[PDB]
Write a protein that binds this ligand. Structure first.
Ligand SMILES: CC(C)[C@H](Nc1ncnc2[nH]c(S(C)(=O)=O)cc12)c1ccc2c(c1)S(=O)(=O)CCC2
Length: 169
């Protein structure tokens, strides 16, 4: 079956959320698009990007190095479409701002705007974790910006519960 997301809670008409590991969701669902929380040189060294690369047995990193050699780095707030390998038809590599490294939080709107070129996506919460954005603010920007159908996988029950409570205020 196509895009068989299960156990998500619908927040708005086009935003759904689950307490789940995006790598395990991608292997089960085989979505048309999985979003990677990338950096501008597509170096998948840890966190979500490192885990998605490891699940492709490093094929995503080799493909990413070839893209950067020909095209140069991405900009913060930008994206590129590459192969999904065994995880999806396509991977949309999106660069959210890293607030812990001084990047502008306003670019989080530009980052989520890349999702609107794809009808259905499996995604992480952009700029959260060690990128330093406030995760409740990242969910609000996602809900206000994305107009296509996005399934957010957030792999922490404590954070998932705080995000659903904040949305339902
Ligand atoms: C907030 C946090 C619970 C979330 N983590 C995750 N969310 C969803 N699926 C996950 N799998 C794994 S794993 C066990 O394969 O490493 C982690 C994970 C997350 C969301 C966004 C970002 C990060 C982390 S980061 O990697 O710190 C920096 C880039 C932006």
């Amino acid at each position: 079956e196509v895009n068989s997301f299960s156990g998500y809670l619908k927040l708005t008409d086009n935003v759904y959320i689950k307490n789940a590991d995006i790598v395990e969701e991608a292997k089960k669902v085989k979505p048309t698009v999985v979003v990677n929380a990338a950096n501008v040189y597509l170096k998948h060294g840890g966190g979500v990007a490192g885990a998605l690369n490891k699940a492709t047995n490093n094929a995503m990193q080799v493909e990413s190095d070839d893209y950067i050699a020909t095209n140069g780095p991405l900009k913060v707030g930008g994206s590129c479409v590459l192969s999904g390998h065994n995880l999806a038809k396509h991977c949309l590599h999106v660069v959210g701002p890293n607030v812990n490294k001084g990047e502008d939080i306003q670019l989080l709107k530009s980052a989520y705007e890349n999702f609107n070129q794809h009808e259905v996506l499996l995604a992480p919460l952009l700029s959260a974790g060690i990128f330093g954005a406030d995760p409740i603010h990242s969910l609000r920007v996602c809900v206000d910006t994305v107009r296509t159908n996005v399934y957010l996988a957030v792999f922490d029950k404590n954070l998932y519960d705080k995000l659903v409570s904040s949305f339902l205020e």
